[PDB]
Design a protein around this ligand. Sequence first.
Ligand SMILES: Nc1nc2c(ncn2[C@@H]2O[C@H](COP(=O)(O)OP(=O)(O)OP(=O)(O)O)[C@@H](O)[C@H]2O)c(=O)[nH]1
Ligand SMILES: [Mg+2]
Lengths: 177, 18, 415, 180
Amino acid sequence: EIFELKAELNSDKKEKKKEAVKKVIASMTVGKDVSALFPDVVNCMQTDNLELKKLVYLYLMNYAKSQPDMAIMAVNTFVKDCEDPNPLIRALAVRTMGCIRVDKITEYLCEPLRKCLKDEDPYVRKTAAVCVAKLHDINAQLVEDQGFLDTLKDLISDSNPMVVANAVAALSEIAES
Amino acid sequence: DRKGGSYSQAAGSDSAQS
Amino acid sequence: SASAVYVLDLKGKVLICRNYRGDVDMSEVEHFMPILMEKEEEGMLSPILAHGGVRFMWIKHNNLYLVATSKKNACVSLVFSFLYKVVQVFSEYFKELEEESIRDNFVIIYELLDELMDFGYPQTTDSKILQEYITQEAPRPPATVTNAVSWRSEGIKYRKNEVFLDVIEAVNLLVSANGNVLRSEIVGSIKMRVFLSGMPELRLGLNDKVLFDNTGRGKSKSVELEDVKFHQCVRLSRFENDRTISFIPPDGEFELMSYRLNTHVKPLIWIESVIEKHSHSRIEYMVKAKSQFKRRSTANNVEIHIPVPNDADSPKFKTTVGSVKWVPENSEIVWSVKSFPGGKEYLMRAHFGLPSVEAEDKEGKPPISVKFEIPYFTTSGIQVRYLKIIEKSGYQALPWVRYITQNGDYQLRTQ
Amino acid sequence: GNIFANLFKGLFGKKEMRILMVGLDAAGKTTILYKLKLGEIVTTIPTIGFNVETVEYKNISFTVWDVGGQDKIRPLWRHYFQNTQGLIFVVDSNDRERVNEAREELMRMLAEDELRDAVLLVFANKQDLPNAMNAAEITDKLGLHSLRHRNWYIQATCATSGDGLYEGLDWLSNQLRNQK
Ligand SMILES: Nc1nc2c(ncn2[C@@H]2O[C@H](COP(=O)(O)OP(=O)(O)OP(=O)(O)O)[C@@H](O)[C@H]2O)c(=O)[nH]1
Ligand SMILES: [Mg+2]
């Protein structure tokens, strides 16, 4: 069971890796405590197919507070994914970075947030605006030190009305607290 | 045909209002 | 400001959960079922629950209740709108709303939940637009979401340019037991299935009372809609300036405009019902239905629901026209009529048995509901005048529209 | 059973093999991996996590898993020891004070009973400054000859130029593959 799943996830075949990821997602959704296998799925993270990357990101987000120590092995992957040409991959990475409830992980994520703040893609801009609000809610002092208030203020005065609305919502949420 | 009233073509604009 | 969007089941099991803010522990969902049971059992059950400092506001779907936990003073209206958008997206993607698809469409469901809302703030809600980025069977996101026009994908091409409209009428009448109508509201519904090539900018034109008065033609038949609600494609500024309805129709069927005004005309159907219920011996149903609608119109599938006794058994029906059936599941006389010519008069004489032993508790007086649906009938008198289909490429459109009249909240209070 | 498909695959090349990338931070590991994969000197930020890539040469897909030399990541090398067939060690001759730390880390990594079939692969990195030692002084200091039942090979590669990469690849192929 668990050993077979770990062996399947530690294989070199993508056809078995996708099935293992789907089974792990179903077990977590079915109500199975799969947080013990978080380090095993860490190796099978950098994959070309976006179908397994989303599942891995969701598992990490759902298994971030449970194993914060084992989550230290994902900063490099997030940094690498924060520069992919595809806007969808960058948006997913930005969303997953802000969803990680790790006190030792948000400190190193300031650079990707600053890089994605001025992204040309409106989806990337919206993802960065959401991640800024998430980080400010998680750590207001880190957000203030990073100087994201000035970037957020200039977001409303730019193009991309969806991105402007997202920035306004993030600023309202930050000012609410 | 179709239940609920047969479909009818619509105009383009108020021709009598210029 | 939802903290976690979760989907439960009829047994209290959470089919799927999607945390948005993470400020609420995932173990609070366990107390939602007992809290709902206590509220329902004491009459305090409400769609917005409260587990201490965390509020569980959600609505009941076809098979599961989409309860979304929240902790701060978030907008309950925003949460309800997000839940409605999610339900609409699921209906567009999944033809059925049951547990069979939750456990079978999790791969696409998780992706849709992640993409729809981030940090409790939704960003995309168009099923047609979202279908180009999340599929269950991924390229860059379409420019429609980034562009202002988020309800009309560019580059759509079709062999023909045919748009079918639907002027659906909802006749809602609240007739009191004294025989007078209290609430008589008719809500218009203009639903169009736009199927054209490109991104045409529809310019809908009708014989509106306000428009006729502004143009100076306030003397002909004009519909005086108390409330006119345009869709997302309809530009609010254009309608506010000079009643100009200019918008880009979407690709498929969608609700463009929904008129809503009170009606001061006589009911299209007059129902004269009598109840000669003897004391535990017998009962009589002298129901007479008179069609006050125009004779040229026929009410297809007339269904006048007559609430019969709950414990009535061995009934005999003496009617004139139409099929009358008593459904034990519903406990009422279904006055089913296939075609009802305008001005028709149907008389019925009910006769059913009753047990000698009286009922332990009262059951109330359910109202009599008519399910008449007469197409090609416009009671409000509103007629479509024009529909300006303009395209940059240039094409000859063939718009179509149909008028269907049905019974909405046409319930008649019993005596 | 029939092995006709295996023979047909081996007639045109079927073996791929694996490889590991370990060493101290700022040891030229990322640059070496980039040169092996692409062939250019790419400047990158320090490896907080790890880098995974593959190299296709001589009909063998040499998959390389770069591992950083961070203090908090030094004990994390045991995660890659499972299902690992190769291992390449990159030395840092430009850090005299870090030479002892690198030798201690290599000795600790060599003291695992699970990683026994992985032959030694010593790469002389930072072969561009006059202060760099030869291919024997570093080995003598590290005592690579005292590794019983371990096949070590010292090769000097210049990060700026890339010379010696072909010789190291040929030596690795000869050590891994024992056929014609
Ligand atoms: N100019 C120059 N610098 C070199 C050379 N060899 C190694 N370096 C230094 O070594 C570092 C190598 O970093 P990377 O190749 O990106 O990755 P790494 O070797 O794993 O180092 P970390 O990322 O810190 O773990 C560079 O930043 C250089 O400063 C060389 O031949 N020329
Ligand atoms: Mg490196």
